[PDB]
């Protein structure tokens, strides 16, 4: 079911390819690309005020509906960093886009992270509370059959937020001939995964009231950027989670904030 073309995605990718194209301007984002290529870091931080001034409508669209918009942004980023250096752009299967700037209405606190801001990149200050063990998550798993001298690469899609199916979640262990498959851990590919919990600051929070906190899933690139007790500003995508399969549902949808970036709020 490969899509032949979509006007929305094509338009958005063109707009952000223009936004990254910085030579007629002062060269700020081109310089950012060049320095991050030199660093080997693979996230580029785009200021929302820059995006708003160059195209307010795209800023409204993105801050109202993130994930597919940022897929467009990141595909544009991959094309752009390939034009600067195809060899480096080939190196990483994805590159990422952090945010920064004046998230005017999109700056709330975990007390005020209502159910109006879903799939919207929200900005939120707060104190960490937990630091779960940063443990791997498998993304592309390679297997070897010694009976048949065979190799396979099962592929996994990061459906941390969408609907996920057992057919997607299968980890193969036997061939079609019921032979034994041995995992190739090194040849496989993994990304770190950590959960943390931001909290409304007690200096900011209401005086007499219980704390309120929000869960934050830091995948790779953001492993140890937040320990307990630290002040941190998290900007990212509040969303819903899928309940695991079962013929019943209550309406409950425990929600998270898949952080797009986190910075030291101490400033």
């Amino acid at each position: 079911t490969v899509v032949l073309d979509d006007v929305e995605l094509r338009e958005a990718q063109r707009d952000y390819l223009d936004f990254l194209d910085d030579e007629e301007d002062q060269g700020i984002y081109q310089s950012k690309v060049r320095e991050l290529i030199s660093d080997n870091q693979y996230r580029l931080i785009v200021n929302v005020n820059d995006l708003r001034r160059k195209n307010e409508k795209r800023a409204n669209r993105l801050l109202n509906n993130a994930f597919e918009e940022l897929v467009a942004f990141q595909r544009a980023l991959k094309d752009f960093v390939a034009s600067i250096d195809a060899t480096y752009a080939k190196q990483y299967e994805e590159f990422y886009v952090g945010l920064e700037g004046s998230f005017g209405s999109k700056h709330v606190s975990p007390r005020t992270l209502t159910s109006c801001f879903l799939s919207c990149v929200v900005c939120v200050e707060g104190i960490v509370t937990k630091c779960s063990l940063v443990r791997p998550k498998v993304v592309r798993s390679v297997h070897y059959c010694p009976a048949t001298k065979k190799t396979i690469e099962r592929r996994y899609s990061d459906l941390t937020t969408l609907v996920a199916f057992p057919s997607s979640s299968v980890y193969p262990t036997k061939d079609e001939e019921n032979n034994p498959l041995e995992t190739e851990y090194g040849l496989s590919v993994y990304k770190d995964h950590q959960t943390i919990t931001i909290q409304e600051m007690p200096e900011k929070a209401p005086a007499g009231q219980l704390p309120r906190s929000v869960d934050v899933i830091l995948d790779d690139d953001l492993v140890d950027k937040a320990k307990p007790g630290d002040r941190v500003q998290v900007v990212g995508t509040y969303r819903c989670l899928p309940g695991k399969k079962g013929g019943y549902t209550s309406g409950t949808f425990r929600t998270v904030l898949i952080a797009c970036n986190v910075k030291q709020m101490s400033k």
Binding site: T173, P180, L181, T183, Y185
Partner: protein, 38 residues
């Protein structure tokens, strides 16, 4: 560590006759039916 499931293994049998022994006696019938007179 829990990413695999290697198969069971077993060994050859060391030690109304059972169906395996009837199998053995059919094998004997085929292997030793001597028809040609001395």
């Amino acid at each position: 560590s829990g990413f695999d499931d290697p198969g069971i293994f077993y060994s050859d049998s060391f030690g109304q006759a059972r169906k395996s022994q009837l199998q053995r006696r059919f094998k004997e019938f085929l292997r030793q039916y001597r028809v040609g007179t001395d």
